[PDB]
Ligand binder design. Sequence first.
Ligand SMILES: [Zn+2]
Lengths: 99, 99, 175, 59, 107, 60, 125, 240, 182
Amino acid sequence: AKLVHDVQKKQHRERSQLTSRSRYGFLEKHKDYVKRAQDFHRKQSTLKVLREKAKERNPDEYYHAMHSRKTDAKGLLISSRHGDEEDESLSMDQVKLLK
Amino acid sequence: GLKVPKAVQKELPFKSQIHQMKPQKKKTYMAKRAVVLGGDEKKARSFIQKVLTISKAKDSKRKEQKASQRKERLKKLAKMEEEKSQRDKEKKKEYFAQN
Amino acid sequence: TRKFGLVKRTLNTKKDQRLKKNQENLTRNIPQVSSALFFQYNQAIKPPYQVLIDTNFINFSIQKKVDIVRGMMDCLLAKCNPLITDCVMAELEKLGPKYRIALKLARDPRIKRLSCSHKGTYADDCLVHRVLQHKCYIVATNDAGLKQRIRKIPGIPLMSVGGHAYVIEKLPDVF
Amino acid sequence: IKDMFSSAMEVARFEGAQIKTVSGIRGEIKRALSKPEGHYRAAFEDKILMSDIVILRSW
Amino acid sequence: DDNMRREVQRDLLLIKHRAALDPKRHYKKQRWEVPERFAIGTIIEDKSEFYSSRMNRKERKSTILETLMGDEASNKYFKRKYNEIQEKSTSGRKAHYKKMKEMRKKR
Amino acid sequence: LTPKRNKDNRNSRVKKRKKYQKAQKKLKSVRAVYSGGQSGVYEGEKTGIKKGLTRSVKFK
Amino acid sequence: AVPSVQTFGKKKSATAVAHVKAGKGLIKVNGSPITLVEPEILRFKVYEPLLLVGLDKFSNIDIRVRVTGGGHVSQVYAIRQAIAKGLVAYHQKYVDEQSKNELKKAFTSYDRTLLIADSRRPEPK
Amino acid sequence: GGAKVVIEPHRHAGVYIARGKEDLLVTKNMAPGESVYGEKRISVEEPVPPTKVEYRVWNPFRSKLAAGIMGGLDELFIAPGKKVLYLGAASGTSVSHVSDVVGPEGVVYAVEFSHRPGRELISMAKKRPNIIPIIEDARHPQKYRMLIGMVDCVFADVAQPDQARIIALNSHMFLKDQGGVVISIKANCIDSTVDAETVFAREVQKLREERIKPLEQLTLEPYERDHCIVVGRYMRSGLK
Amino acid sequence: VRKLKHHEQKLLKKVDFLEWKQDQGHRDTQVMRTYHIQNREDYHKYNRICGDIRRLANKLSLLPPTDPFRRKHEQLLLDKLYAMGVLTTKSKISDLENKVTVSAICRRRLPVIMHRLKMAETIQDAVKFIEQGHVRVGPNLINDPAYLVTRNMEDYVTWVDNSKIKKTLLRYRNQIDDFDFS
Ligand SMILES: [Zn+2]
């Protein structure tokens, strides 16, 4: 502040939602809108990237991990929620010892 | 969260597959078997959880405060470097204008 | 029952340690700032001062007709002990037979002399090292580069021939 | 947009005007809706919310 | 062995997260992963000086965790700090979202 | 129309009393200050021991 | 562990996956039997892979079909395509090639759209 | 006071850190079951049943070498198999810690000149057998040149103004080439007319004049005002 | 060979059993470790081709800029080197010394375009697959890795049918049809 008064760079206070329009809570202002909009834009950006990879899959794509990894009925990916260092089904003598 | 559509994610490459594991609806035997201890052990578990979240939130507060510190140090440092480079590019023209 | 993708074994210049460029098969150290220092004050130095001389300071002393110990004494108004390191002396001797006057004015019993222990006769390196090790030294110099080094390391007063007498800068008690 | 006008004649008088929400989302009023009278159709920079107020700055 | 690491695995966590046990202690920033060879030992305060560092027979325990759990001022601080971290962390996530929706719906 | 100013600036002596207290609190950060020796029983280092850092001045 | 075979039958947006393996002779569409496939006037469109070649081919194998998508007539066309080319592929892989191409000849003489759909369209005149 | 710590090996071999909520510099105990100067101890049960071995807290306000260790020295030469010649073993305070850092397979020659400290040194060297107490003046190493042979590190906690001559004489007699020379310099006891940096610079210059190359110095400031440890090695040919 | 002493480093310095002057930094060895060339002499039978096209581009630069024989032959050479995909565009004749590389004429090989379009996942496994005989360009199988392709045939690099790794990826995505016998 070189030639500015402190009574000039005061604090303008921000306004609230109208009490008649109060069930839609919190009238949002420009900081809230930019927090909304850049979130939407980064999620659309990663959706567009994934759509382009789906367009450029190249179906002659062999990996060695598509022996172990498998696919459910709708076509999505089965991820086994147990381990991947364990086994989901345990043997009969293991069940004998645990029981 | 980012909700990628099923029509896109069934047609994704093998590297770009999204490992989304389904919730468990069956009361499996290992979960109905496995024992948890009580009393002093459950208050030890509660204590260790409280200590670990206080440590993690303190670390997050510290690193956010360091981010706010070093962005303004970056600002003043770039201003001082711009003033320095202005002084260098006028002193060089002085030197060559004299010689 | 052979193997597939069979190759001729050659040497790997990225990997083979038998050749020379692949012969390259923690404790930090943050030296504490000296307990002799306040922020940039150097609260510990006190007269009798001791002053490290170098060759262009001696040459400018003789060119300006200032005595070494008397110029130091009426610059600082204190009792001075001037020190010629063996590398500064080596540099004055290497200056040749044009500088005989400067060499046999540096040969003076009033000017004491240190014994540097390193190879080579680079007096600027020796003065910088032995002053940033210890912070109990005034550096008397007229080299522009050595003046910038010394006045960038903190707590070290710098003396220099200016005009017809010595001047001192980073010593905050001169009057 | 619901109630800044009382009639489709009023909206017809004000067509094409630039409005904005309180979030600074710029916009433009396009056409008066037929059956609810002062209600109109506006187009914005992106999706506005139900907790906003649009503004036609006049003099 | 892992059989003993599964017994001292909690106070090693306490020593790793020393910095948030007391709000006034403020250690110097190291990382301290679990060392490969260690040993758990008990301090012998001798029979020369009394009453100053002396933790009596009636309050000697068997871990660092039982001492920290027996401390009642630390329990006050941990419960209070955890409740404020909790209500900061659940500030606007899902209960807020559905009570905003019910606010819209009620009228 | 003056700016808001400082009660510590209203006295030239108290300002240097409180910018020297600030300075000698900053000096504990840069150096390690001799505080006066062992106060009571040696409790421990109270702040940590680093086995990797060596804060000693190497020669040349 | 079992000799099994999977084929696909498609019309407009219906799609039917047929698993054929060795068994006792049961033909099941969407869990229910084949004799329940509505709209009940095209049940013989579903049946004609069986009646064109005889039930003695189906007396030793069990088929199951899972049909999604489409409408009523697109689903019966997907079912009959899946059944037909699944019987052909089973007799290729696990029975002899002479019965394989006898089945291909019988289905192709009836209509080759039991085995090959009409897939990519239109024509830009 | 009855709490539990975790023992962890330091960077320096033979010394340890006990982490609690205040962490302690700690050494193993060569004579288990008693304290020497009233320090506290830590008893671990290491695994015939497990045996209770114990550890002693090294107090940096009562040991210049521990002040140096926990200020941070890049290299001590006191190591778990070595021979140390302690000069100025003023009691058994730091000599006990040097002794059990050095271990049962190494030797500490504790040189002291006064006699009641010598009596306490001999009664401590009974229960620590790796201490050879030598009651003699260090200013004349020939008076005990028969009792000591070929040490690996000299430590000097003498507080006399002829320190560098004492260190040089004992090093030239008993230290081997590229062995360790650890010095605790007290500025006020050398001389108080000059400042601490002047007397440290002069003592380092005296060491390199007696051909001991200094590697490192440390001020050890929170525990002692105007002290220093200078760690050097006995180069004997070519400080350059 | 012994990490010689100092009077040793000085007395003989140009001795080096590993790397001579005429190795040119072992660029043949380095680029065949990069693109995994099976036998020797492929590098130099590509380097002869590089030298021949820069020599005849030199003598096409020699001829005067007006005659149709010169201009037709340089546009014909540029179009053929585009048509075998050695280049990526039909740019300047200065790229016939800046951009033709023994590297790029190895880039047009069959395992490295296989790794490029992610048919394999490393060039070594690509040479594994095409020595095991799984792939084809159009109708015919490819057995040797020395078959480099043209700009038209990066679209019909596909496996053969009954190739069981093709069958494993189909049953991975469970689109495994078996009427088409794979
Ligand atoms: Zn020198």
